[PDB]
């Protein structure tokens, strides 16, 4: 009941220090008198005698009563004095003691030890009353004293080295056992200790604010302060002495005692930040660990928390509310020039802090301790009792910016900075999901509505500087909550005053960003300016001029995130995220990771980033197809993770996969089909999973062979696996949409074969799928599939194993046969035809009244329908034929058409037939053909006889033969000439010993020297046919005739093959290459051929060729080795005449015309292939006596164009070319120079002379290309233009204009400089 205005109040506590005083006195007097300790006092001699550690913490209580009451003045000096001598003794007392305690020691010397701690704590706490008396404002000399403070301080240290750091270290090992355990049984007597030591180093604190000391002082101070920051907490309160928490007080005190020093000394603040930086790297990695925990639950290094706490001190005309909000731009003008020395103090430690850790990270060990920082410093992004850590961040993300950005810097410095720029692009990343989150919760309160309209406004950039600035905004609220939460928490204050700055600066922005006039807001504008001045000189004004309501943690944290988004860091993310996304094209192979990494965390962390007009979308396409193998690779992987958060991408994101089907790596392209495969199980859509099996099958003809099989595997898995009819569609689909009917079929065959994984399990699926097709065309009204194209994969089903169709079903195509003779549709009809042809001979039953009448409807379409098909139907007839025991139809089809032949001769001696008996020879001949080809009536050889009497030998081919071949000559119209020689190619590839006969080759060879295109592709294909099943043959016997035509054709067929570079020469390339490939021909006649057509540029040719010339001379090394010269002169004749382009080297990639030359000759190895580069040098050389342009000018520019550029293997070969280049050029160089000089014909000697500038041009770019045995390395910057042009430039020298010509001359005169 003593609790009055602040006067009666301040006399109480005058009264009551008084009354304690005189006790305390009259105590050390009692205690004098009688030799004995009083309660209060401790008798030492006696003559002295000082005051106990408890009425010293009585006296110290009522002395800041005084204080703060401001009594304190009255307080009689003379008895002050008094005191203070009472401590002083109390203090020399304990001078030259050792109270440390020793881990040596036993049980009984803390006993001996515990016998100290009566003086001891009466000194703690004496200097503790002395240092409060010198906190008092009072004036007299009497009350200060420098020695004082120095024993205070020697208290301090002598306490920190000796007993709290021990003890906090000391744990319960064998060696300390017994140590520990008697420390743990005097607990008790420990902690007042303890406490007394908190209370004095806090009190220096509080000294060196209000009194001014030495600088050995407050240094000693940081050394120590220094030292407790690092103190050993026991990690579970099971091993220390004493409850973990007391150490965690001391720890505080620490950071508080190092705060005070770093603020009231600014000339040495960057070193007390630079010192306590390299004190943290002078220590085990025990001690880094994240042992300072936050209220919120996270946790951080202690040296993390003190240094924010540092950047956090630096906030350590109008006078009226209503003149502010007139004259608004005052207002704004003052607040300006009181808060932007605050931030601009703050920035500048925060600098400090992080040059010197990006410093020593770099011009170094150090680096993980940045990692460190970083971490912690993220983990306090959010929270808004940590403002600095946003601070430490954009100014460390502005330098890493920085060091990206610049070019002038190392590997080192860009590695790092991208790798931190990746964990900050992430932390962001987080902290906008969060906001997303924390806005989208459903809030019957106004400040949590407000706050939510603010973050939908803030997640996108929509400007707002006016509401977030707002008297009651974000800024408020999260004032208002640390507030609550705080009166006495230095950080949390620290904290408060340094938002309090950003908000003043944040309200000066926003007003002058603006240069208009809108008055409201200008006048709302100076009312915070006021308010936040006021604010910024006395941190109390707020709670004491307003009050408001009560802010919950996820109001301020939300209020707080709100505020990040529009700080300078986070307003960074796009920026730094496309520093990130074009990094996964990097070089080293831990950036990329890292940066994938990131990446990866940044799209988890808010998804929303891929919506709409996605960059991370579009960058990682532009990923896929990087020009690096790799960087694909994993771009497949981002591809997979986009998918995965945002499954709408799917579809438009699987056609960059099943491109990477056809990607170089072969591993990408397996990567890119697995992908696909898990995604054809995800998505249902029909084009989709159509795509994907349609990439997927083309991949079965894959060159490496691991990719083979797992085209394969997959394909058995997603197609051939136990919505039948959605199989079925999803099939018909994928052969309808691209040139997948060959591949499939050998899927199914090297599925269906037998000894195999799964065949008899896998065939009645087939089956089953095969019954369903036709059950889908045994019946309407849906988007099902046509029943072509159902036929279409029938068919190929059909040609693939028989076995699987049953004749019920090809009752269901009956019909279809019927329609044949008109039906235009042909793709059913063949269809259809195949099937019976396929599935038919397969049947047991033999049903002969089937037979018989499928082939009495099938015989007369023979008369109409075309070839393509008269083909399948003419197999078809013979197969039914075969299975029934008749064959007169046949041979009564073949001879009437025969007779219709002669009936067309015998015509022709009339009048020369017409347009229209030309077309009625077309079909009988075409018909006596395909009769030929599928089905040749030997055994009937008397069926014959009886209508052409004249007939004897039994060959039936021969008088097909040697009936339609008069028609082959010349004498002819073409419309005749054509259908004769398809007829009697068609009958010889079936019978080919007609081939050798003088009937036909005579027309044959008449046809190759006419030089007719169309009638010699009707040989060629005969031949082609022939020869390929010669080769399914050997992989009745009809050796020597192959050879007797191959070798009498052999220079046609070759001729049209090297004369021409369209489709027409492919056919007759592919009847060299199975030439070749049997061993009718010697690899003499065929290799230059086929080296010179591998340098075509239409790629079927170029790609036969170069596996014929690879094969040959894997097998025919010996004899290519020796036809170098004649190889070079025919790819330049065949560049220069055939290709019509005699560069030496394509333009883009730049690559030569004999890459492949030299490609098939890295299989040779040795010196084998140097010789060749010698050889190409060799066949350069010329002698003056030869000839625009000369022929070895042009021939010898083809050649060293191609030595420009050769993706050389080792630099023997090229040390040896440039050797054979420069002795060629210094031996004839010499005469050609000589005779220069001398006679000056010219453009002779210019001829001369540009062969030879250019061969050195090409030298010195090689030279410099690589370097002034094993493989060899390409220089950075040498491309390959600047020869390119120079060369030109020298071969453009005789087109001239006399002059140039005559330089060309001087520039070889003085090349080789002789005379």
């Not at 002495?241 to 190092?258: C, P, S």
């Not at 197969?879 to 041979?891: D, V």
């Amino acid at each position: 009941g003593e609790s009055l205005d602040l006067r009666q109040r301040a006399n109480v506590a005058l009264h009551e220090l008084k009354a304690y005083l005189q006790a305390a006195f009259q105590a050390v007097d009692r205690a004098i008198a009688q030799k004995s300790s009083n309660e209060m006092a401790i008798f030492l001699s006696e003559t002295e005698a000082t005051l106990a550690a408890p009425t010293q913490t009585k006296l110290q209580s009522a002395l800041k009563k005084t204080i703060e009451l401001n009594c304190f003045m009255t307080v009689p000096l003379d008895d002050l004095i008094y005191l203070l001598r009472l401590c002083d003794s109390a203090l020399r007392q304990t001078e030259s003691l050792d109270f440390s305690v020793q881990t040596s020691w036993g049980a009984q010397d803390v006993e001996q030890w515990l016998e100290l701690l009566p003086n001891l704590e009466a000194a703690i706490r004496a200097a503790r009353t002395s240092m409060r008396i010198m906190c008092g404002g009072r004036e007299e000399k009497q009350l200060y004293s420098e020695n004082a403070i120095e024993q205070a301080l020697s208290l301090c240290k002598r306490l920190i080295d000796g007993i709290i750091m021990p003890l906090a270290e000391l744990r319960n090992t064998s060696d300390t056992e017994e140590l520990f355990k008697a420390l743990s049984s005097c607990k008790r007597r420990i902690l007042p200790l303890m406490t007394d030591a908190q209370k004095l180093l806090s009190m220096m604190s509080e000294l060196i604010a209000k009194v001014d000391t030495s600088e050995t002082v407050t240094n000693a101070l940081e050394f120590a302060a220094s030292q407790l920051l690092f103190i050993e907490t026991a990690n579970a309160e099971r091993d220390s002495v004493i409850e973990t928490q007391k150490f965690d007080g001391f720890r505080l005190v620490a950071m508080d005692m190092i705060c005070q020093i770093f603020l009231l000394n600014p000339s040495q603040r960057q070193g007390i930040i630079d010192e306590i930086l390299t004190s943290l790297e002078k220590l085990p990695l025990g001690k880094r660990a994240r042992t300072f925990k936050l209220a919120d639950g996270s946790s951080i290094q202690p040296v993390s928390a003190l240094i924010m706490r540092l950047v956090q001190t630096s906030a350590g005309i109008i006078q009226s509310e209503a003149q502010g909000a007139s004259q608004h731009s005052t207002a704004i003008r003052d607040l300006d020039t009181i808060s932007t020395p605050l931030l601009e103090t703050a920035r500048n430690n925060a600098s400090y802090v992080i040059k010197f850790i990006v410093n020593r990270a770099l011009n170094s060990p150090y680096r993980n301790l940045l990692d460190l920082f970083v971490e912690d410093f993220i983990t306090c992004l959010d929270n808004p009792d940590w403002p600095a850590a946003e601070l430490l961040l954009r100014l460390l993300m502005l330098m890493m910016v920085g060091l990206v950005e610049n070019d002038k810097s190392s590997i080192m410095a860009k590695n790092m900075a991208l790798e931190l720029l990746g964990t900050m692009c992430a932390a962001i990343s987080k902290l906008r999901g969060h906001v997303r989150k924390m806005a989208s919760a459903l809030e019957a309160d106004e400040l949590s509505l407000f706050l939510s309209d603010l973050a939908a406004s803030a997640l996108e950039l929509k400007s707002r500087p006016e509401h977030m600035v707002a008297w009651t905004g974000p800024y408020r609220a999260t004032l208002e909550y640390l507030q609550s939460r705080s009166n006495e928490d230095a950080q949390l204050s620290s904290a408060m005053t340094f938002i309090i700055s950003e908000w003043g600066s944040k309200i000066c922005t926003c007003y002058d960003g603006y240069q208009d006039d809108v008055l409201e807001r200008d006048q709302e504008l100076g009312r915070l300016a006021y308010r936040l001045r006021e604010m910024i000189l006395d941190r109390k004004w707020l709670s004491t001029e307003y009050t408001y309501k009560d802010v919950s943690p996820l109001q301020a944290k939300l209020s707080y995130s709100i505020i990040l988004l529009r700080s300078q860091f986070c307003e960074a993310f796009g920026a730094i995220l496309n520093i990130l996304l074009n990094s996964m094209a990097s070089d080293q192979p831990t950036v990329r990771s890292k940066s994938l990494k990131s990446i990866n965390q940044v799209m988890e962390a808010d998804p929303t980033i891929l919506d709409g007009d996605s960059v991370v979308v579009q960058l990682i396409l532009r990923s896929s197809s990087d020009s690096s193998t790799q960087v694909r690779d994993s771009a497949l992987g981002l591809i997979s993770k986009c998918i995965s958060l945002r499954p709408a991408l799917e579809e438009k994101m699987t056609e960059t996969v099943v491109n990477r089907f056809s990607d170089a790596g072969p591993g990408v392209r397996k990567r890119a089909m697995k992908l696909a495969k898990d995604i054809y199980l995800r998505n249902s859509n029909r084009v989709l999973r159509s795509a994907i099996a349609n990439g997927l099958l083309h991949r079965v003809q894959d060159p490496e062979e691991s990719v083979r099989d797992l085209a394969r595997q997959v394909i058995e898995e997603i197609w051939f696996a136990p919505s039948l009819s959605e199989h079925v569609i999803l099939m018909v689909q994928t052969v309808k949409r691209g040139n997948v009917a060959n591949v499939l079929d050998k899927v199914l065959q090297a599925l269906l074969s037998p000894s195999s994984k799964t065949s008899q399990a896998s065939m009645e699926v087939c089956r089953k799928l095969v019954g369903s097709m036709f059950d889908l065309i045994d019946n309407n009204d849906a988007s099902a599939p046509s029943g072509r194209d159902v036929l279409q994969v029938l068919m190929i089903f059909a040609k693939a194993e028989a076995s699987l169709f049953t004749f019920e079903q090809l009752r269901l195509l009956r019909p279809y046969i019927a329609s044949i003779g008109t039906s235009e549709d042909l793709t059913v009809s063949r269809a259809v035809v195949v099937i019976y042809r396929r599935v038919l001979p397969q049947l047991s039953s033999a049903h002969a009244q089937f037979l018989t009448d499928v082939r009495k409807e099938l015989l007369p379409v023979v008369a109409k329908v075309p070839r393509a098909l008269l083909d399948d139907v003419m197999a078809c007839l013979w197969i039914i034929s075969t299975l029934l025991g008749t064959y007169e139809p046949l041979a009564r089809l073949v001879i009437s058409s025969l007779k219709g032949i002669q009936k067309t001769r015998a015509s022709a001696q009339v009048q020369p037939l017409d347009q229209l008996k030309i077309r009625q020879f077309d079909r009988y001949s075409l018909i006596v053909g395909m009769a030929g080809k599928h089905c040749n009536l030997d055994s009937h050889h008397e069926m014959f006889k009886e209508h052409f009497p004249k007939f004897s030998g039994a060959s039936v081919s021969k008088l097909m033969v040697d009936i339609v071949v008069p028609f082959a000559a010349p004498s002819w119209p073409l419309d005749v000439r054509k259908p004769a020689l398809d007829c009697v190619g068609l009958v010889c590839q079936s019978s080919p010993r007609n081939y050798v006969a003088a009937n036909v080759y005579t027309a044959f060879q008449q046809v190759f020297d006419d030089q007719i295109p169309i009638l010699e592709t009707m040989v060629l294909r005969s031949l082609k046919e022939f020869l390929f099943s010669e080769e399914k043959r050997s992989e009745t016997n009809y050796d020597d005739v192959a050879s007797a035509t191959t070798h009498r054709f052999l220079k046609d067929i070759t001729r049209i093959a090297t004369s021409t570079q369209d489709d027409h020469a492919f056919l007759a390339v592919e009847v060299l290459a199975s030439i070749n490939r049997q061993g009718l021909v010697h690899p003499k006649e065929t290799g230059v051929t086929f080296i010179t057509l591998a340098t075509s540029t239409h790629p079927r040719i170029s790609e036969l060729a170069f596996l014929e010339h690879k094969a040959l001379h894997t097998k025919h090394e010996t004899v290519i080795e020796r036809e170098y010269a004649k190889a070079i002169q025919s790819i330049f004749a065949y560049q220069r005449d055939i290709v019509k382009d005699p560069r030496g080297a394509t333009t883009n990639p730049f690559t030569p015309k004999l890459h492949l030359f030299m490609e098939v000759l890295k299989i040779s190895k040795a010196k084998n292939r140097v010789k060749f580069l010698e050889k190409l040098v060799s066949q350069i050389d010329f002698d003056i006596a030869k000839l625009e342009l000369p022929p070895h000018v042009q021939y010898s520019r083809f050649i060293i164009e191609n030595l420009a550029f050769f993706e050389y293997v080792t630099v023997g070969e090229i040390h040896s070319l440039v050797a054979a280049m420069e002795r060629l050029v210094a031996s004839t160089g010499a005469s050609v120079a000589q005779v220069i000089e001398s006679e000056v014909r010219l453009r002779q000697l210019t001829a001369a002379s540009m062969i030879l500038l250019a061969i050195w041009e090409v030298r010195t770019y090689l030279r410099r290309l690589y370097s002034l045995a094993r493989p060899p390395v390409k220089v950075q910057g040498v491309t390959g233009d600047k020869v390119w042009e120079e060369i030109n430039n020298i071969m453009g020298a005789l087109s001239g204009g006399r002059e140039r010509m005559v330089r060309a001359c001087k520039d070889l005169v003085e090349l080789m400089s002789i005379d």
